[PDB]
């Protein structure tokens, strides 16, 4: 199924991990759907929003 | 100089001499040569996070 792997960036804002696990879960199902997912915090891509694919927040 | 709406990559004299063996590979191709964006798009997935993980070993 590769070649996706469209680019799926998933960003989280989390203090106690609920949102962070949800984010990583999404990135896990993306991998199953051929994407090329990336997981990171929200305020680390501050300004660096992906101008291609899509960004789950 | 880094404003891509005003300036694009040039082949310096140095790079023009190295094209003699680098050709229209990614490094010595002009941005407007068809082979640049095609190779960029084809090869960027080799530097995805999953690819990187798979080079580790």
Curated annotation (Swiss-Prot), chain B:
This protein is a target of protein engineering. Its selectivity-directing and activity-enhancing mutations have been extensively studied and the designed mutations allow this enzyme to act on non-native substrates and/or in order to enhance production of synthetically desirable end-products. Induction: By pentobarbital. Expression is negatively regulated by repressor bm3R1 at the transcriptional level. It comes from the Bacteria. It is found in: Cytoplasm. In the N-terminal section; belongs to the cytochrome P450 family. Functions as a fatty acid monooxygenase. Catalyzes hydroxylation of fatty acids at omega-1, omega-2 and omega-3 positions. Shows activity toward medium and long-chain fatty acids, with optimum chain lengths of 12, 14 and 16 carbons (lauric, myristic, and palmitic acids). Able to metabolize some of these primary metabolites to secondary and tertiary products. Marginal activity towards short chain lengths of 8-10 carbons. Hydroxylates highly branched fatty acids, which play an essential role in membrane fluidity regulation. This is Bifunctional cytochrome P450/NADPH--P450 reductase. The gene is cyp102A1.
